[PDB]
């Protein structure tokens, strides 16, 4: 068969303390630089884009992460790190390791994310070598999109103000988690928001008139389970568009053009690559996923 | 049989190399040009 | 119009055991280095003492335990071989123009395999010289420590 | 005698047989495992015969060729081999025909300006004497550019493999997946330097395994008439960056477009562009510059073709 | 080759133009400089070799 | 008619002298006209056709 | 050289160099006299001829 292995030579024998921290992270996905066999440690982790002296930019780290090649750690020696790599369609074994624990099952999606909840938990230092290996985290997509939801909320309102229960906490089912957005560079996280502002005052320019009226026949008349954000007070702008009549051949175009700008918002709500899980063993926490980039 | 240019330095015999030929063929920089 | 000459480099390299650098190292070639993982040779080194008769406590013999390890160095040489090159390596040939076509595939593969084997003899001399320079402190530090 | 020569050629291209080690008998297990380990050890040494045995394991997937059939006046006999092919399928013709549009033939339908394309404007006129034989076969070159529906009709196909040109009917063979084998060499996709806009050039990003080629088809106005412009891009930065990088390339077009849309608003006018995913060139295989007759044409190598749906950007 | 192991970038070319000038001022007309030099016949020999 | 380069599989001869010094730079800044680099997958004797 | 740092290792390289001749032409000149060519032929005259 074909070979796929990436050995990483340690130029100095690492300590016994930080050897146990790496062996706890066995079977963990980490993105490295180049697709060849002998690799330097300074191109191993994600620490080239997530520094300590500078403010980490969680968009730019995640933007960097869908460029790379991804590898799975298999053996930690005191002299070497052996890693198998991930072909774009190959059945490979993976292990659930990550510290904010989330249950996986078969037929789930996964997504590789920057260390959003705790930077210090992911970064382990090699002071016997001078580099810090920064692991990412792999998270299912219903939670993986949900952090990119809450992070884009934060860069809007904290620019309005300059409070810590709505703009930062991520509500998973039955749990809330705090994000580590204390010292961050927002200069690319506002670039995504500057790209939302183009699509959002286009989707508002072609709202279909029939769907505005189906709210006003439902926000005050009956009970639907997820309309309860809207109370009996209708928004003031819905009725100020209601004033004209309905017309089917002027709403087929207002649905077709609205259909195409919803396909375009999958360029602005992207996660990284995907891990199609087809098997899982909770006695071992050892899944077996199926890789697919883009 | 080894070919080397030996020189006597006070009391000791010390050979003198120059490996710059194998780095000028392969176009890599020689490590003694710090 | 003429064709006045046709010429080509032939590369020869003095291998590692014929350079003068082997006067600074001992060369014991092992069969398969992949069998042993770490070398952890332990030495018991004992120093001598001078017997004094002064008022301090008497001289006791001393041992020092020095733990010399083995550093592994890995080397890779990559070789590209064409697909049409080896498609006519397997092919059946009987005409004299396909003997001189098969001579072009056996002189390409064996020249791309003396490429990767030459590059490992250049990798010995580099990865000994890189070892000798990562353990060579300069004169100005070592002259006063050497005294 | 001559039938025995073919027996040696078929029996030299067969796949290697799978090792059948019997796990039920005693000595038959010992002699079958020994021939696994007398054979892996002779596939690891750097001798030539071990490398002679190593390439018969052939896990190759194959290109899937499509046989098209085009009129000979919508497709030049002077087309470079490796030209990308589109398919325009607006309606159902009375005969089984097809309209294949190369990027130098889609320059004559578009009518985009020669200041953008200085070299492929002289070429697209010398092959197409009037430009009418293309435009007569599309009756909606103004209503498909106004509403923004021309990119919904094109399907990307792949590079060209064979062109049997005749007087009235031209046979065109493409390669829709994989690397296309000529009809024997491997045909790489050939784009002009006039159309291809790189993104990887800059003043250390990861050396990934793969780099992709996209196709953008962009709606705009010239001479106060609907037109368009098709450009090609090349990067491996992932899908979220490139859509944000193509919007930076077309900054000067959108600002000069909505001067007119600030006057009047139709909902047929808002859709702007569409990005496809053509295929994947391997990493750092640099394209070789060629010239035709002087047309700078980048020909790639090992370009396997893919097919992405047209996703809108604005 | 010690000046151009890395390749002729912009800073190497500038570093060689300073050396075409420094060798043209000092070491030109080398056989006419042998009279005034007290060393003399060994300067020409290291120049010409 | 100018003389041109051709990659036909000639029987090349062996010279005692080395040629390798300063070749990598001389491709970039042209020491000599009419050269052609050949990288790994394409550095071989071409198939003879006539 | 194959060495095992964090490099991407180089594949096999190859160069091909073409050289050509340079033509040169040399001219000369001879002016023979009129009467020199004329009296090259007649003989069996007086010993002064």
């Amino acid at each position: 068969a074909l070979d796929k292995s990436i050995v990483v030579n340690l130029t100095s024998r690492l300590f016994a303390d930080e050897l146990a921290a790496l062996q706890s992270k066995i079977g963990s996905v980490l993105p490295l630089g180049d697709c060849h066999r002998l690799q330097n440690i300074q191109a191993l982790g994600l620490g080239c884009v997530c520094s300590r002296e500078t403010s980490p930019d969680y968009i730019q780290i995640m933007q960097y992460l869908s460029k790379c090649t991804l590898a799975v750690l298999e053996e930690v020696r005191p002299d070497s790190l052996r890693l198998t790599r991930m072909d774009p369609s190959d059945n490979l074994q993976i292990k659930n390791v990550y510290a904010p624990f989330f249950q996986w099952d078969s037929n789930t999606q996964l997504a590789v994310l920057p260390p959003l909840f705790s930077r210090k938990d992911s970064t382990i230092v090699l002071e016997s070598n001078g580099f810090d290996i920064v692991f990412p985290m792999v998270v299912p997509q219903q939670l993986g999109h949900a952090i990119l939801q809450q992070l884009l909320v934060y860069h809007i309102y904290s620019k309005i103000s300059a409070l810590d229960l709505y703009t930062t906490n991520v509500s998973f089912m039955g749990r809330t988690y705090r994000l580590d957005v204390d010292n961050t560079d927002p200069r690319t996280a506002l670039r995504v928001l500057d790209d939302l502002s183009m699509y959002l005052c286009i989707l508002s320019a072609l709202v279909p008139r029939g769907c505005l009226r189906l709210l006003t026949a439902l926000v005050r008349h009956d009970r639907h389970p997820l309309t309860e954000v809207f109370e009996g007070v209708v928004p003031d702008e819905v009725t100020r568009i209601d004033l004209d009549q309905l017309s089917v051949p002027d709403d087929i175009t207002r649905m077709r053009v609205m259909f195409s700008y919803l396909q375009s918002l999958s360029s602005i709500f992207n996660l990284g690559p995907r891990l199609h899980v087809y098997a899982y063993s909770a006695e071992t926490l050892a899944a077996s996923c199926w890789y697919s980039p883009r | 049989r080894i070919a080397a240019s030996l020189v006597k330095i006070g009391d000791k015999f010390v050979a003198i190399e120059s490996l710059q030929r194998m780095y000028n063929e392969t176009q890599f920089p020689c490590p003694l040009n710090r | 119009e003429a064709l006045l000459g046709v010429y080509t480099n032939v590369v020869e390299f003095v291998k590692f055991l014929e350079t003068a650098l082997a006067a600074a190292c001992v060369n014991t070639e092992f069969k398969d280095l992949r069998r042993m993982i770490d070398g952890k040779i332990q030495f018991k080194i004992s120093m001598p003492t001078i017997a004094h008769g002064d008022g301090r406590r008497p001289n006791k013999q001393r041992q020092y335990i020095v733990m010399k390890a083995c550093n592994k160095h890995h080397i890779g040489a990559e070789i590209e071989l064409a697909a049409a090159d080896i498609e006519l390596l397997f092919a059946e040939k009987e005409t004299p123009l396909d003997f001189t076509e098969y001579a072009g595939a056996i002189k390409t593969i064996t020249s791309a395999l003396q490429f990767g084997m030459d590059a490992l003899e250049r990798g010995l001399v580099d990865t000994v010289l890189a070892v000798k320079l990562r353990h060579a402190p300069p004169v100005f530090i070592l002259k006063t420590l050497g005294d | 005698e001559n039938a025995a020569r073919l027996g040696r050629q078929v029996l030299g291209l067969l796949p290697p047989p799978t090792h059948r080690v019997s796990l039920t008998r005693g000595p038959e297990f010992a002699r079958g495992v020994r021939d696994l380990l007398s054979k892996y050890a002779a596939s690891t040494r750097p001798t030539v015969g071990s490398l002679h045995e190593a390439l018969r394991q052939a896990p190759f997937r194959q290109p899937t060729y499509g046989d098209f059939l085009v009129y000979s006046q919508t497709f030049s006999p002077q087309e470079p081999l490796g030209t990308f092919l589109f398919s325009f399928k607006q309606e159902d013709n009375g005969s089984s025909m097809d309209m294949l549009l190369t990027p130098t033939s889609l320059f004559m339908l578009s009518g985009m300006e020669a200041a953008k394309a200085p070299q492929t404007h002289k070429v697209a006129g010398v092959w197409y004497g009037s430009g009418s034989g293309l435009a007569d076969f599309i009756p909606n070159l103004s209503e498909l550019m106004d509403t923004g529906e021309f990119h919904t009709l094109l399907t990307p196909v792949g590079p060209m493999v064979q062109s049997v040109h005749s007087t009235f009917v031209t046979k065109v063979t493409s390669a829709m997946k994989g690397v296309g084998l000529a009809r024997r060499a491997h045909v790489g996709l050939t784009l002009p330097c006039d159309m291809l806009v790189d993104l990887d050039e800059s003043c250390r990003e990861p050396a990934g395994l793969n780099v992709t080629i996209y196709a953008s088809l962009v709606y705009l106005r010239v001479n106060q008439r609907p037109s368009m412009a098709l450009t090609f891009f090349q990067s491996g930065k992932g899908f979220a960056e490139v859509v944000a990088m193509i919007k930076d390339h077309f900054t000067d077009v959108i600002r000069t477009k909505y001067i007119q849309l600030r006057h009047e608003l139709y909902i047929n006018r808002l859709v702007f562009g569409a990005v496809c995913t053509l295929g994947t060139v391997p990493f750092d295989s640099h394209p070789v510059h060629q010239s035709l007759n002087s047309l700078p044409v980048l020909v790639f190598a090992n370009f396997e073709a893919a097919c992405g749906p047209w996703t809108v950007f604005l | 080759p010690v000046y151009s192991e890395r390749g002729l970038k912009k800073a190497v070319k500038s570093d060689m133009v300073s050396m075409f000038k420094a060798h043209l001022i000092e070491h030109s007309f080398f056989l006419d400089k042998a009279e005034l030099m007290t060393r003399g016949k060994q300067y020409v020999l290291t120049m010409l070799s | 008619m100018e003389a041109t380069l051709e990659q036909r599989p000639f029987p090349y001869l062996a010279t005692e002298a080395n040629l390798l010094t300063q070749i990598k730079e001389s491709a970039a800044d042209g020491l000599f006209k009419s050269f052609q680099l050949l990288l790994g997958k394409d550095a071989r004797e071409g198939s003879v056709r006539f």
Side-chain angles (χ1 to χ4, degrees), chain B residues 2 17 22-23 25-26 34, chain C residues 17 19-21 122 126 133:
Chain B
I2 308 300
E17 275 184 347
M22 68 169 285
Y23 290 99
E25 292 177 351
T26 66
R34 304 294 191 92
Chain C
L17 292 171
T19 63
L21 197 152
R122 310 296 184 95
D126 197 8
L133 291 174

Side-chain angles (χ1 to χ4, degrees), chain A residues 33-35 63-64 66-68 85 191 195 198-199 202 206 253-254 256-257 260-261 264 266-267 270 294, chain D residues 149 204-207 209 212 214 235-241 243-244 247-248 267-268 270-271 312-314:
Chain A
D34 302 337
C35 292
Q63 197 180 8
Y64 176 83
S66 62
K67 287 180 175 175
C68 296
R85 64 183 293 271
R191 177 66 178 271
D195 294 332
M198 295 184 288
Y199 293 112
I202 285 172
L206 41 89
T253 63
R254 289 180 182 174
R256 183 180 64 239
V257 180
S260 65
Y261 285 104
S264 66
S266 64
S267 71
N270 276 316
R294 294 177 185 270
Chain D
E149 293 177 352
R204 180 174 172 175
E205 293 185 355
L209 186 65
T212 64
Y214 295 146
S235 66
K237 292 172 177 66
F239 184 72
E241 295 200 1
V243 181
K247 291 174 184 174
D248 291 334
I267 304 170
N268 289 320
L270 276 84
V271 58
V312 189
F313 70 99
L314 182 56

Side-chain angles (χ1 to χ4, degrees), chain A residues 30-41:
Chain A
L30 59 97
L32 49 87
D34 302 337
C35 292
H36 65 275
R37 197 261 306 282
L38 286 92
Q39 196 66 250
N40 196 2
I41 191 169

Side-chain angles (χ1 to χ4, degrees), chain C residues 1 3 6-12 80-82 84-85 88 97 100-101 103-105 107-108, chain F residues 1-2 6 10-15 17-20 39-41 43-48 50:
Chain C
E1 59 182 0
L3 192 146
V6 166
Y7 303 111
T8 281
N9 191 15
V10 169
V11 181
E12 293 177 352
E80 283 180 352
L81 295 174
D85 193 8
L88 64 96
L97 190 142
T100 190
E101 183 72 29
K107 287 168 68 177
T108 298
Chain F
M1 186 65 204
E2 298 288 325
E6 58 182 359
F10 296 155
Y12 289 94
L13 273 67
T15 59
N18 55 356
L19 299 174
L20 293 166
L39 296 174
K41 68 185 76 174
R44 69 184 183 275
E45 290 85 2
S47 67
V48 47
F50 60 95

Side-chain angles (χ1 to χ4, degrees), chain F residues 17-37:
Chain F
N18 55 356
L19 299 174
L20 293 166
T21 59
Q22 300 289 320
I23 293 298
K24 181 71 179 296
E25 188 270 321
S26 302
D29 295 332
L31 177 58
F32 48 83
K33 297 295 290 182
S34 69
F35 64 97
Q36 180 71 39
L37 281 79

